[PDB]
């Protein structure tokens, strides 16, 4: 039994959430924000990402050099990431270097200089990154997957944004974005590791008290996405490995089918030829794939957002003449989630998840990420007991019912990249989403 | 029938004193009248090999055993097409009729059968 | 971590307040002790293959029912086999480790079909990073044998089943085995290890064939997969001041989209390269290395010259600020090393097997500017500098240029 | 060989009494002058490809009608293009050389489909011998660039059509071209070369980018083609005494099924290894090399230690008999080199292109025992010993050990 | 017919002033009514490729030309199946209709034809 997550509020509406650990000597403190690239329009797309760059480019007081020195003097590191619906700015430091790291964060968030010269310097950096994301094949595949699944919708936009916007983002647009979105009722100050909650709340009162509140404070994790069955093919015969993702519309964080979708995802599971144990996994798809050498890897996913999600699989394969077999057998395993799954598969997957959901929370950063994610998406840290109960309530009937409404005979979003000549047209892939024998 | 089945049933018989006393002499005469040794075969050379399990066990043979098996098959094929029997050193002596393949196929089948059982496990 | 002894096996455990336990077996069987090149990597990959009581297949299927995970790695000093599971499943995991150490059937087909292919993919994935290659080549030049043996199996030196069986006969023995339990009740572990590992051979301490000898030289590795350069300095007397020196010199950034205030980080300015100062304490010997990776070989050449200059500049004199930074960053490094289970296991493993009492992060020494500058001065004036170039080696610097 | 000049081109010919003539074009375009690695090898392989007047195909079909043959090779100093034919067919061969030098269409498809594949098979065949590899690696260590450039094209550094076109623009020019005719009437050759090579550009002398530098070190090439080791000693002052030294030291047997009376030959006794002392005069620098190839790395290690000892023993004392034997072996070596058409062409080529007058075999200097001792002592006291292990490099000696 | 034949005959015509004066305008009208440019093709995209000679010439194309040809074939195939014509930038302008392939195939055929001639040479 892990220690209780303590939670307090300030007057402005800033949540402070902490989970202490006496064994560690190092503590992760950071700010989880319920805002991301989804909050941009098509004219400022890429602003959130641009700000992340400029947050570490100098503040009202300290310059970029001074900022660097200050963090180095603490001894720890600062890190940040922007997603579609969440922005995070954390600081891993020593036990005694927690107050100073908290001070640095409040400064970069509330009073960043955003100098015009610094903007111009970052423009080139971001422009370079736009023509360097190509290398990260998995990211390319998933960015195209969102773009096609949520065609012409805010969830379908890239985080980096288009080249055109990058050349036109001004300090005004930047300031407007962070003034509208980085409000106290949308922010959670999170501490994990060697933190005292009462100390953290005092530091929040000292640094984050003059944060604006939004005009209409909705609860944390408050959102209509209309999924498009569709495909993107990025054929490249010079690549040796094909990368293919297939997804259907999945479930949001607060769906009643949230855990049922995770159990279904665990029945298919992951596979990697480089891991020694993978040839012995219980998953039917894993056995088919390893015995026939159909793939280098596959990873099932169930990605959630506030009002939608994507559930599917990501495959990598060098077997270019049997891509058809790989996809065929994958979708036939999905069909079995609706037609054949019994207590056997379900209980096995639940057993695996019961551990996996706790196992994920390794170090202080992992714990802080969990607290922050849960606070910004659900509005609360769900206790392991509640999670164990929600998983226990998933039955074989629930999985079959969920699959029959979500997978069976449904439109898919499909992205292929690389030597995908062997990937059949949309109809033949989508026809595998049902079985004529059933 | 699986090699596993054959080996286990044979072991049940060899355990029983009565059974072994009556079965072992019959099995030895059977093998003499079978006459595979007169084509220079070992018993295991006759086992059906066109299954996934057997192809796996044959790939696991040590290279020397594998090369010698190839030669015995080619030599028996040449006796068969000529309508001749082995003579002299080509005849398999009872002491040379070793079960070189049985251990490999028993391991292949042990895994295959465990996989089938474990595919049907029920969390209690 | 309460150190004890259970049936002749050293057991260290630290109870916690979490649902997840980590149990690690640390073996004195890393590559410095290897008998044949690559055998310690192959032995690591042979863990949790078929044992007499439990097949690899059955183990994996049962591990999935507990939702446990398995992690293994090889260093120059240890093989580490770690399992992560829910607290209550402890007896199963202790028994599984016992089966591996006492009853592994080392079958030829497992070596050919399972173990060696996985070892080969492991190495190819690591080598995708040219910095990994450069730092491995630097150890090979600097120490030749022992610490200079390759950590990983290579194709050019084939490990046989007899090699792995012999090495396992030495390594899998009470004298070479330490058990480390994170978030494990110490009294419960001692009782279980005491019953499970009672019939393990005693064996003898595996020793390094030959004394550690220090050499200088160059190693040019032509790859077509990116460029790196290590400037390593073998140390005959490994001092803890080199830890502070590495942390000071630095190389990486401590914030996103930044270079960093560290000397080596300020040597990459204007290029697309990355530097990393790394000290490797190895008991009898040591290695201080400055690894510079990058795309352009000319860019690397530039940074390499600035890197050597930075070390000389440090040797001249460092300020009180710089000294305080070195200590702060070194204490943080120690803290996170003792936190991460991968490295935690090996730290206590070294205390249990070897005898080197762990240095707590709170007991990391503060080095004065004098002591830091003296340490850097001792490195700039080394008689045996090692340079390992990887990639377009014709365009990368040579030792005599640096 | 009567040296003359015909339309700005240096022409050397020697008439004979045979039906067979050899005509060679020697070009100052060997690898020491190579703009990019491998370009001189690729240029050599591009000779007799499609020219504007005559396709590669038509040339080969016509060469078969004359029964002629074509030989080409690349050294560190030259590209040599040689044809062998009946005396009377001289004008055809002169015209074919002119077409190659003036009118080669350097087409991309020839590079991809014809030239580069042939260059790659050429190299793989040479590398089948690990002694070739060891001696190539030793030049690379000793000189780095220039003389340290690879002679042959390698896969890791691709030569482009633009590279080869640029280099050919420099090399195929009157200043870099010498014509050598064996069993060719000298007056007839001068008249033909004078009409055929009149419109060739004048160009300028190709030079080595940078001054030749001397270095020491190691080169461990992990192969499985066999095992070899070169003990090279770079010479800053090229002297003819090292020719007699190499001959004296020896290594190969003078008779079938023997070992040989030579010091190096008497270091292989008991083993199945083979040694060869070789001196490489390059005008501005030199290289004395002792290459030991064999099956067993342990055997090689033994011979390698005896090899360095033999050199030290020579430095101590050579007998008068040994000095006379060195003169005899060296005179014979000179004679056969001037006979072999491949080496003959390059010897006169050096005289014509540089100005280094050939040393006739009858004018080979006799070095006194004192002179030979001096030479070997200088090599034993070289401050830059180069070692190049090929094969199981872990089991082959290092520079420090020798 | 060989590309060589077509190119040589065309060159005979372009030489003759009279002939060119009458043929070049007809050829230009022909090309306009042919209408291949309205599917975004270049003329050379239409040449029959299923011959050893043509497969060799296509392998010799620079990678850029080769990738662009692939795109134009796929784009024309999509116009064909949709019963649409190119519009705007997809229409091939007369200045874009370059003979990118002709030089490669003329070299392939020159070698092929020389080989045939030389296979029939008679020593005099």
Coordinates of C-alpha atoms in Angstrom, one line a residue, chain D residues 2-402:
Chain D
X2 CA 65.7 5.6 -75.2
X3 CA 63.9 8.5 -73.5
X4 CA 62.5 11.1 -75.9
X5 CA 59.7 13.6 -76.3
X6 CA 56.9 13.5 -78.8
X7 CA 54.4 16.4 -78.9
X8 CA 55.1 17.3 -75.3
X9 CA 54.7 13.7 -74.1
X10 CA 57.6 11.7 -72.7
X11 CA 58.1 8.5 -74.7
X12 CA 60.6 5.7 -73.8
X13 CA 61.1 2.7 -76.1
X14 CA 63.4 -0.2 -76.4
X15 CA 63.5 -2.3 -79.6
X16 CA 63.8 -6.1 -79.3
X17 CA 63.8 -9.3 -81.3
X18 CA 60.4 -10.7 -80.5
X19 CA 56.9 -10.8 -82.2
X20 CA 55.3 -9.3 -79.1
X21 CA 55.2 -5.6 -78.2
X22 CA 54.0 -4.1 -74.9
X23 CA 52.8 -0.5 -74.9
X24 CA 52.1 1.1 -71.5
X25 CA 50.7 4.5 -70.6
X26 CA 52.0 5.4 -67.2
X27 CA 49.9 8.2 -65.5
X28 CA 50.8 10.3 -62.6
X29 CA 47.5 9.5 -61.0
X30 CA 48.1 6.9 -58.3
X31 CA 46.4 7.0 -55.0
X32 CA 48.8 9.5 -53.3
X33 CA 47.3 12.1 -55.7
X34 CA 43.7 10.9 -55.3
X35 CA 41.3 13.8 -54.7
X36 CA 38.8 11.5 -53.0
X37 CA 39.5 8.0 -51.6
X38 CA 39.4 5.3 -54.3
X39 CA 39.3 7.7 -57.3
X40 CA 42.5 6.5 -58.8
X41 CA 41.3 2.8 -58.7
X42 CA 38.0 3.9 -60.3
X43 CA 39.8 5.9 -63.0
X44 CA 42.0 2.8 -63.7
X45 CA 38.8 0.7 -64.1
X46 CA 37.3 3.4 -66.4
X47 CA 40.1 2.9 -69.0
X48 CA 38.8 1.4 -72.3
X49 CA 35.2 2.2 -71.4
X50 CA 33.1 4.0 -74.0
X51 CA 35.0 6.7 -75.9
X52 CA 33.4 9.0 -78.4
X53 CA 35.1 7.3 -81.4
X54 CA 34.9 3.8 -80.2
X55 CA 32.6 2.0 -77.7
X56 CA 34.0 -0.4 -75.0
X57 CA 32.3 -3.2 -76.9
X58 CA 33.8 -2.4 -80.3
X59 CA 37.3 -2.1 -78.7
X60 CA 37.1 -5.5 -77.1
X61 CA 35.8 -7.1 -80.3
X62 CA 38.7 -5.6 -82.3
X63 CA 41.3 -6.4 -79.6
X64 CA 40.2 -10.1 -80.0
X65 CA 40.8 -9.9 -83.8
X66 CA 44.4 -8.7 -83.1
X67 CA 44.7 -11.2 -80.2
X68 CA 45.9 -8.4 -78.0
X69 CA 45.5 -8.3 -74.2
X70 CA 44.9 -5.4 -71.8
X71 CA 46.3 -5.1 -68.3
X72 CA 45.7 -2.2 -65.9
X73 CA 46.7 -1.6 -62.3
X74 CA 46.9 1.2 -59.8
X75 CA 49.7 1.9 -57.4
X76 CA 50.3 4.7 -54.8
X77 CA 52.2 6.5 -57.5
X78 CA 50.8 5.5 -60.9
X79 CA 48.0 4.2 -62.9
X80 CA 49.5 1.8 -65.5
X81 CA 47.5 0.8 -68.6
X82 CA 49.3 -1.8 -70.6
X83 CA 48.5 -3.5 -73.9
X84 CA 50.3 -6.6 -75.3
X85 CA 50.1 -7.2 -79.1
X86 CA 52.0 -8.3 -82.2
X87 CA 54.7 -5.8 -83.3
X88 CA 52.9 -4.7 -86.5
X89 CA 49.7 -3.7 -84.7
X90 CA 51.4 -0.7 -83.0
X91 CA 49.4 2.1 -84.6
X92 CA 46.1 0.7 -83.5
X93 CA 47.2 0.6 -79.9
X94 CA 48.6 4.1 -79.9
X95 CA 45.3 5.4 -81.3
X96 CA 43.3 3.5 -78.7
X97 CA 45.3 5.1 -75.9
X98 CA 44.8 8.5 -77.5
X99 CA 41.0 7.8 -77.6
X100 CA 41.0 6.9 -73.9
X101 CA 42.9 10.0 -72.8
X102 CA 41.1 12.5 -75.0
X103 CA 37.6 11.2 -75.5
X104 CA 36.3 9.0 -72.6
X105 CA 32.6 9.6 -72.2
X106 CA 32.3 9.1 -68.4
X107 CA 28.7 7.9 -68.2
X108 CA 26.9 7.2 -65.0
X109 CA 25.6 3.8 -66.1
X110 CA 29.2 2.7 -66.8
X111 CA 30.1 3.7 -63.3
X112 CA 27.2 1.9 -61.7
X113 CA 27.0 -1.2 -63.8
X114 CA 30.5 -1.8 -65.1
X115 CA 33.3 0.1 -63.4
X116 CA 32.3 0.1 -59.7
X117 CA 31.3 -3.7 -59.6
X118 CA 34.6 -4.7 -61.2
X119 CA 36.5 -2.4 -58.8
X120 CA 34.7 -4.1 -55.9
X121 CA 35.6 -7.6 -57.0
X122 CA 39.2 -6.6 -57.6
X123 CA 39.5 -5.5 -54.0
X124 CA 37.7 -8.6 -52.5
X125 CA 40.1 -10.8 -54.4
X126 CA 43.1 -9.0 -53.0
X127 CA 41.8 -9.0 -49.5
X128 CA 41.4 -12.8 -49.6
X129 CA 45.1 -12.6 -48.6
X130 CA 45.3 -11.2 -45.0
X131 CA 48.9 -10.2 -45.7
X132 CA 47.7 -7.7 -48.4
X133 CA 45.3 -6.2 -45.9
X134 CA 48.0 -6.0 -43.1
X135 CA 50.4 -4.2 -45.4
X136 CA 47.7 -1.8 -46.6
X137 CA 46.7 -1.0 -43.1
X138 CA 50.3 -0.4 -42.2
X139 CA 50.6 2.3 -44.9
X140 CA 47.4 3.9 -43.6
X141 CA 48.7 4.2 -40.0
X142 CA 52.2 5.3 -41.1
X143 CA 51.2 8.1 -43.5
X144 CA 47.5 8.8 -42.8
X145 CA 47.0 10.8 -46.1
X146 CA 48.8 10.8 -49.4
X147 CA 50.7 7.5 -49.2
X148 CA 48.3 6.6 -46.5
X149 CA 45.2 6.8 -48.8
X150 CA 43.8 3.5 -49.7
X151 CA 44.9 2.3 -53.2
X152 CA 41.5 0.7 -53.9
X153 CA 37.9 1.9 -53.8
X154 CA 36.0 0.8 -50.7
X155 CA 32.2 0.6 -50.1
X156 CA 32.3 2.9 -47.1
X157 CA 33.5 5.9 -49.2
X158 CA 31.6 6.1 -52.5
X159 CA 33.3 7.6 -55.6
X160 CA 30.9 9.7 -57.7
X161 CA 30.9 10.3 -61.4
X162 CA 31.8 13.9 -60.7
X163 CA 34.8 12.9 -58.6
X164 CA 36.1 10.6 -61.4
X165 CA 35.5 13.2 -64.1
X166 CA 37.4 15.9 -62.1
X167 CA 40.3 13.6 -61.4
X168 CA 40.5 12.5 -65.0
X169 CA 40.6 16.2 -66.1
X170 CA 43.7 16.6 -64.0
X171 CA 45.4 13.3 -64.8
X172 CA 44.6 12.8 -68.5
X173 CA 46.9 15.7 -69.6
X174 CA 50.4 15.8 -71.3
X175 CA 52.1 16.7 -68.0
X176 CA 51.0 13.5 -66.3
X177 CA 51.4 11.0 -69.1
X178 CA 54.4 8.8 -70.1
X179 CA 54.4 6.3 -72.8
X180 CA 56.7 3.2 -72.4
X181 CA 57.2 0.7 -75.3
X182 CA 58.8 -2.7 -74.8
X183 CA 59.9 -4.3 -78.1
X184 CA 58.8 -1.2 -80.0
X185 CA 61.0 0.6 -82.6
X186 CA 61.7 3.9 -80.8
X187 CA 61.5 6.1 -83.9
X188 CA 58.2 4.6 -85.0
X189 CA 56.6 5.1 -81.6
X190 CA 57.7 8.8 -81.4
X191 CA 56.1 9.5 -84.8
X192 CA 52.8 7.9 -83.8
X193 CA 52.5 9.3 -80.3
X194 CA 53.4 12.7 -81.9
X195 CA 50.3 12.6 -84.1
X196 CA 47.9 10.9 -81.8
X197 CA 48.6 12.7 -78.5
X198 CA 49.0 16.2 -80.1
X199 CA 45.6 17.5 -79.1
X200 CA 45.7 16.2 -75.5
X201 CA 45.5 19.1 -73.0
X202 CA 48.7 20.2 -71.5
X203 CA 47.2 20.5 -68.0
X204 CA 49.5 20.8 -65.0
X205 CA 51.4 18.4 -62.8
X206 CA 49.2 16.6 -60.3
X207 CA 50.5 17.1 -56.8
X208 CA 49.9 15.4 -53.4
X209 CA 47.6 17.5 -51.3
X210 CA 49.8 18.2 -48.3
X211 CA 53.4 17.1 -47.3
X212 CA 54.1 13.5 -46.5
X213 CA 54.0 12.9 -42.7
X214 CA 55.4 10.0 -40.8
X215 CA 53.4 8.4 -37.9
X216 CA 53.4 5.4 -35.6
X217 CA 50.7 3.2 -34.1
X218 CA 48.5 0.1 -34.4
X219 CA 45.8 -1.1 -36.9
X220 CA 43.7 -4.0 -35.7
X221 CA 41.5 -5.3 -38.5
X222 CA 39.1 -8.1 -37.3
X223 CA 38.7 -10.5 -40.3
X224 CA 38.1 -14.2 -40.7
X225 CA 40.0 -14.6 -44.0
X226 CA 43.1 -15.6 -42.1
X227 CA 45.7 -14.1 -39.8
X228 CA 48.6 -11.7 -40.6
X229 CA 50.8 -9.1 -39.0
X230 CA 52.9 -6.3 -40.5
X231 CA 55.8 -4.8 -38.5
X232 CA 56.3 -1.6 -40.5
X233 CA 59.1 1.0 -39.9
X234 CA 58.5 4.3 -41.7
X235 CA 61.7 5.9 -43.2
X236 CA 62.1 9.6 -43.5
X237 CA 65.3 9.3 -45.5
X238 CA 64.8 6.8 -48.5
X239 CA 68.1 4.9 -48.9
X240 CA 69.0 2.0 -51.3
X241 CA 70.6 0.1 -48.4
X242 CA 67.1 -1.0 -47.3
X243 CA 66.8 -2.9 -50.6
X244 CA 69.8 -5.1 -49.7
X245 CA 68.5 -5.2 -46.0
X246 CA 65.0 -6.5 -47.2
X247 CA 66.7 -9.0 -49.5
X248 CA 69.1 -10.2 -46.7
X249 CA 66.4 -10.5 -44.0
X250 CA 64.4 -12.4 -46.7
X251 CA 61.6 -14.7 -45.5
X252 CA 60.6 -16.8 -48.6
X253 CA 62.4 -20.1 -49.5
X254 CA 64.9 -20.1 -52.3
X255 CA 64.0 -23.8 -53.2
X256 CA 60.9 -26.0 -53.0
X257 CA 59.9 -27.7 -49.7
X258 CA 62.7 -25.7 -47.9
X259 CA 62.7 -22.9 -45.3
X260 CA 65.6 -20.8 -46.5
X261 CA 68.9 -19.7 -44.9
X262 CA 67.6 -16.1 -44.4
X263 CA 67.2 -14.8 -40.8
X264 CA 63.4 -14.3 -41.2
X265 CA 63.0 -17.7 -42.8
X266 CA 64.7 -19.3 -39.8
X267 CA 62.1 -17.6 -37.5
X268 CA 59.3 -19.7 -39.0
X269 CA 61.0 -23.0 -38.2
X270 CA 58.5 -25.3 -36.4
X271 CA 55.5 -23.2 -37.4
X272 CA 53.3 -23.1 -40.5
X273 CA 53.8 -19.3 -41.1
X274 CA 55.4 -17.3 -43.8
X275 CA 57.4 -14.0 -43.5
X276 CA 58.5 -11.4 -46.1
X277 CA 60.7 -8.4 -45.7
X278 CA 59.8 -5.6 -48.1
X279 CA 61.2 -2.1 -48.7
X280 CA 58.9 0.5 -50.3
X281 CA 60.8 3.5 -51.7
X282 CA 58.4 6.3 -52.4
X283 CA 61.0 9.1 -53.2
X284 CA 60.2 11.5 -50.3
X285 CA 59.5 8.7 -47.7
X286 CA 60.0 5.0 -47.3
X287 CA 58.6 2.0 -45.6
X288 CA 60.3 -1.1 -44.3
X289 CA 57.8 -3.9 -43.7
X290 CA 58.0 -7.4 -42.2
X291 CA 54.7 -9.2 -42.9
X292 CA 54.1 -12.6 -41.2
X293 CA 51.0 -14.5 -42.3
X294 CA 49.9 -17.9 -41.0
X295 CA 47.0 -20.0 -39.8
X296 CA 47.6 -19.9 -36.0
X297 CA 47.7 -16.5 -34.2
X298 CA 50.0 -18.0 -31.5
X299 CA 52.4 -19.2 -34.2
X300 CA 52.4 -15.6 -35.7
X301 CA 53.1 -14.1 -32.3
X302 CA 56.2 -16.4 -31.9
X303 CA 57.6 -15.5 -35.3
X304 CA 56.8 -11.8 -34.7
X305 CA 59.1 -11.7 -31.6
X306 CA 61.8 -13.6 -33.6
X307 CA 61.4 -11.1 -36.4
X308 CA 62.2 -8.0 -34.3
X309 CA 65.1 -9.9 -32.7
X310 CA 66.5 -10.7 -36.1
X311 CA 66.4 -7.0 -37.0
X312 CA 68.3 -6.2 -33.8
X313 CA 70.8 -9.0 -34.4
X314 CA 71.5 -7.5 -37.9
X315 CA 72.0 -4.0 -36.3
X316 CA 74.6 -5.7 -34.0
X317 CA 76.6 -7.5 -36.7
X318 CA 76.4 -8.7 -40.3
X319 CA 79.1 -11.1 -41.7
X320 CA 80.9 -10.4 -45.0
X321 CA 79.2 -13.5 -46.4
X322 CA 75.8 -12.2 -45.3
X323 CA 76.6 -8.8 -46.9
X324 CA 77.5 -10.6 -50.2
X325 CA 74.4 -12.7 -50.0
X326 CA 72.4 -9.4 -49.6
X327 CA 74.0 -7.9 -52.7
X328 CA 73.4 -11.1 -54.7
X329 CA 69.7 -11.3 -53.6
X330 CA 69.2 -7.6 -54.2
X331 CA 70.8 -7.5 -57.7
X332 CA 68.6 -10.5 -58.7
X333 CA 65.5 -8.7 -57.4
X334 CA 66.3 -5.6 -59.3
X335 CA 66.9 -7.6 -62.5
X336 CA 63.6 -9.5 -62.4
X337 CA 61.7 -6.3 -61.6
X338 CA 63.1 -4.6 -64.7
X339 CA 62.0 -7.7 -66.7
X340 CA 58.4 -8.0 -65.4
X341 CA 56.3 -5.7 -67.7
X342 CA 54.1 -4.4 -64.9
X343 CA 57.0 -3.2 -62.8
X344 CA 59.2 -2.3 -65.8
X345 CA 56.6 0.2 -67.0
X346 CA 56.5 1.9 -63.6
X347 CA 60.2 2.0 -63.2
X348 CA 60.7 4.0 -66.5
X349 CA 57.5 5.8 -65.7
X350 CA 59.1 7.1 -62.5
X351 CA 62.2 8.2 -64.5
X352 CA 60.0 10.0 -67.1
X353 CA 57.4 11.5 -64.9
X354 CA 59.7 12.5 -62.0
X355 CA 63.3 12.6 -62.9
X356 CA 64.6 9.7 -60.7
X357 CA 67.1 8.0 -63.1
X358 CA 66.6 4.2 -63.0
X359 CA 69.2 2.1 -61.2
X360 CA 70.2 -0.6 -63.7
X361 CA 70.5 -4.1 -62.0
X362 CA 74.2 -4.1 -63.0
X363 CA 74.8 -0.9 -61.0
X364 CA 73.1 -2.0 -57.8
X365 CA 75.4 -0.9 -55.0
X366 CA 77.2 -3.4 -52.8
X367 CA 76.7 -2.5 -49.1
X368 CA 79.4 -3.4 -46.6
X369 CA 78.4 -5.4 -43.4
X370 CA 78.9 -2.0 -41.6
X371 CA 76.5 -0.3 -43.9
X372 CA 73.8 -3.0 -43.5
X373 CA 74.3 -3.0 -39.7
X374 CA 73.8 0.8 -39.7
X375 CA 70.6 0.4 -41.7
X376 CA 69.1 -2.2 -39.4
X377 CA 70.2 -0.3 -36.2
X378 CA 68.3 2.7 -37.5
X379 CA 65.2 0.6 -37.9
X380 CA 65.6 -1.1 -34.5
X381 CA 65.8 2.4 -33.0
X382 CA 62.8 3.8 -34.9
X383 CA 60.7 6.0 -32.7
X384 CA 57.6 5.2 -34.7
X385 CA 57.0 1.5 -34.9
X386 CA 53.7 0.6 -36.8
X387 CA 51.8 -2.7 -36.1
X388 CA 48.9 -3.9 -38.3
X389 CA 47.2 -7.1 -37.0
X390 CA 44.6 -8.7 -39.3
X391 CA 42.3 -11.6 -38.2
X392 CA 41.9 -12.8 -34.6
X393 CA 43.4 -9.5 -33.4
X394 CA 42.9 -10.3 -29.7
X395 CA 45.5 -13.1 -30.1
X396 CA 47.9 -11.2 -32.3
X397 CA 50.9 -9.1 -30.8
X398 CA 50.7 -5.4 -30.0
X399 CA 53.3 -2.7 -30.8
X400 CA 54.3 -2.4 -27.1
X401 CA 54.9 -6.2 -26.8
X402 CA 57.3 -6.2 -29.7

